[PDB]
């Protein structure tokens, strides 16, 4: 939460913009649940590590400002 821009790790960026540049289709892997979502990754799918398993999730239009860690619940319950 700071006005010098939201914070991501660069390598996953480079692959995902070349991905949406040439061929939008298939899924992208990550171990980093830390990157802030940018509003130009609408429609894709990301396999995010929860600490134990890679989980796919779909990014919609309203998915702005969050991080990808909001959707891989690390801990379960009843």
């Amino acid at each position: 939460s700071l006005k010098k821009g939201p914070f991501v790790d660069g390598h996953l960026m480079t692959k995902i913009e070349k991905l949406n540049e040439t061929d939008k289709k298939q899924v992208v892997k990550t171990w980093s649940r830390r990157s802030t979502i940018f509003p130009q990754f609408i429609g894709h799918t990301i396999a995010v590590y929860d600490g134990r398993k890679h989980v796919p999730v779909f990014i919609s239009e309203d998915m702005v400002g969050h991080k990808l860690g909001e959707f891989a619940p690390t801990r379960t319950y009843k």
Binding site: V57, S60, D62, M63, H66, G69, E70, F71, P73
Partner: protein, 108 residues
């Protein structure tokens, strides 16, 4: 009355307009100063034009009939959007990262 809601009539106007949904003490006082209607009045015996020139300013700020629904729409957006924060809101667990071992009887 003022914006739908009535006002306790025998008190000071600065205390009295905080009973409406959307302004607290600090926000009420500065719009009341811009209104310029004394700010140390009993609302029981003020006059009608000083009663009415605040209607236009509370129209351009926002109150219960809009804040209630926008916070509702935003919070159900957070509900069905699939967030961890949304599912915590759904399950009644605390949201601001507080520990659920010993407390949060305010919820659940």
């Amino acid at each position: 009355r003022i914006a739908g809601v009535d006002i306790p009539r025998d008190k000071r106007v600065v205390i009295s307009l905080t009973y409406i949904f959307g302004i607290g003490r600090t926000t009420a006082q500065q719009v009341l100063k811009e209104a310029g209607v004394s700010e140390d009045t009993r609302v029981r015996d003020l006059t009608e034009e000083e009663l009415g020139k605040i209607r236009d300013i509370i129209d351009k700020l926002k109150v219960e009939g809009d804040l209630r629904r926008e916070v509702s729409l935003n919070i159900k957006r957070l509900i069905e959007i699939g967030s961890y924060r949304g599912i915590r809101h759904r399950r009644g667990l605390p949201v601001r990262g507080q520990n659920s071992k010993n407390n949060a009887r305010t919820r659940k």
